[PDB]
Amino acid sequence: GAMEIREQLNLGGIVNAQNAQLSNCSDGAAQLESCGTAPDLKGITGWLNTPGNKPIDLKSLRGKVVLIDFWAYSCINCQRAIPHVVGWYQAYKDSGLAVIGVHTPEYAFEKVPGNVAKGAANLGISYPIALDNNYATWTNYRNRYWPAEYLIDATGTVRHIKFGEGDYNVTETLVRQLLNDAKPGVKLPQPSSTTTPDLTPRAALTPETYFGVGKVVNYGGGGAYDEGSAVFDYPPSLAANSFALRGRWALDYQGATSDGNDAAIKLNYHAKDVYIVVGGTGTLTVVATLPISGPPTTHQVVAGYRLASETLEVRPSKGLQVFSFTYG
Amino acid sequence: GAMEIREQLNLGGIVNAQNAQLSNCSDGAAQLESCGTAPDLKGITGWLNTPGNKPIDLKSLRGKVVLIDFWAYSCINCQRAIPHVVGWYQAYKDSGLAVIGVHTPEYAFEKVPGNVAKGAANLGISYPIALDNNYATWTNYRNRYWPAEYLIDATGTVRHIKFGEGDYNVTETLVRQLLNDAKPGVKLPQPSSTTTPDLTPRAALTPETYFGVGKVVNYGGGGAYDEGSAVFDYPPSLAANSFALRGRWALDYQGATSDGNDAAIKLNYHAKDVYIVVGGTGTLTVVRDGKPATLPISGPPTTHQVVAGYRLASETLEVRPSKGLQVFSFTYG
């Protein structure tokens, strides 16, 4: 529990000499703010989309407007936001905009450079990517949400910080203002939002449904949910926005691996679209069948007509590991 | 870290049969929403402002619109928000509005019935107060912040949930709508917002500055900050929105107690007003821009304003608490 003023940035981690002024900015303000020199990009385990995959020091970007975008490739929220970021990079890179996609992993499989690179290609990311496998940059920036953006002006000062998915036009308007501050009289094309649709869902979807023993918050099944294998069964009645298991499953801090060939998952949700984050090679049947292979990622299992309360069952073939259910 | 859609309620605790649909509401929506029957008010250790101090069961309030208001008496955000709630209670009680202030304590001293009562008296609260000393209700409601509000319609269904300070008119508008839904044609006085000013600060103040060993996030003195008594000194340079200690101090998980006649705190903050939550009996000496002030400290621990600025800005100040005074935090306005 904490006190909060609406629109206040809910920063994580602690205060150090580099990030002490970040709290001087609010969460996604419509007007430019000023909250200190951008903290260093540190502990980056590797880079992508840069010459010889060499690192980029923010100080080398002075003179340009810089947008720091925190993401994770399997994150559905990030998947919906990134197209807007790609559009901005495309529209403004030749006008003074630099973009750095800081990839801070939510899961272990997101620490694999190859999986990340594959995810980026699918999203059309061409801008530099910094792998934040030790959460050093995420922590230095006092972030706590996916997606998250920090907008830096040409002098290296943070002028806008936005946590969460949505409100693209607010941010693009400030990016345009800063490009002009950096290069007075600069001529820019019409806003990228003109041709990039805002597909942000109403913010009342089922909470991210984790299967990791240590993160689980909505397992509506009777009875314990600890590590190791065991045989589960659906309860007489499952709570709304909750899930239950049927069959043999193996549970660990990462997720739930389908064991027996009878394993099944029942889910009561509230959304329009449903996605499952699964790893491994196998087949996934939903009550339709879907082949599962390659780097773990989101697989859409529900493409609804509208946002409403519904139920669905998923049968992961043995071997398939479920990390969570995300929504849209 | 977690995923988030802006305006999404960042609920806490786990999902149970009573609160499973709360996530169906967004954070402070301007239109009515529907997110399940209101969870039970669980494990309340005491009640104030009810006949015989007896408990209130939400089911007994069916037919009335019910506003659940989570607060803590020493919370400055809550202190600024409550006058709005008091205004609503006074304006709508006779039109069908029931209000319950669930007092979930942030500090141990806030669990004391008498301290809460005095805090409530100072704030003009005359509506029922439920002491949530074991956080049972806070948890059943999956709340995460002070202040927080849950608006329940006459059928006992939650239709609005708002976390944090601000946006009073959005909520009052829904309260009026629900009062009409409960009693179609009901006549209401003009909105309380008409006579109650919105004094919500810009949302860019120094974060709540805790002195508790397990909560501290902006101690810039450098070195160890563990529980026990020790001698401190100010660092060569103190970072913005941070504090440092000088002199002897005794630290624990509740706060920092002055343990000498030389104890002092230096604070770099970004706000207009500054308050210190402190307990014990003694005197507090504060110096801002070369101007000192002496403050007598006694009675229930609570907020004491140490700075009344003219505008929001980055500033520094020093506080020297007589030995024995316990500093819990610095909060802002």
UniProtKB/Swiss-Prot annotation, chain B:
Residues 32-180 form the Thioredoxin domain. The gene is dipZ. The keyword S-adenosyl-L-methionine does not apply. Keywords: Cell membrane, Membrane, Transmembrane, Transmembrane helix. This is Protein DipZ. One of its GO terms (molecular function) is antioxidant activity. It is found in: Cell membrane. GO terms for cellular component: plasma membrane. The keyword Disulfide bond does not apply. GO terms for biological process: cytochrome complex assembly.
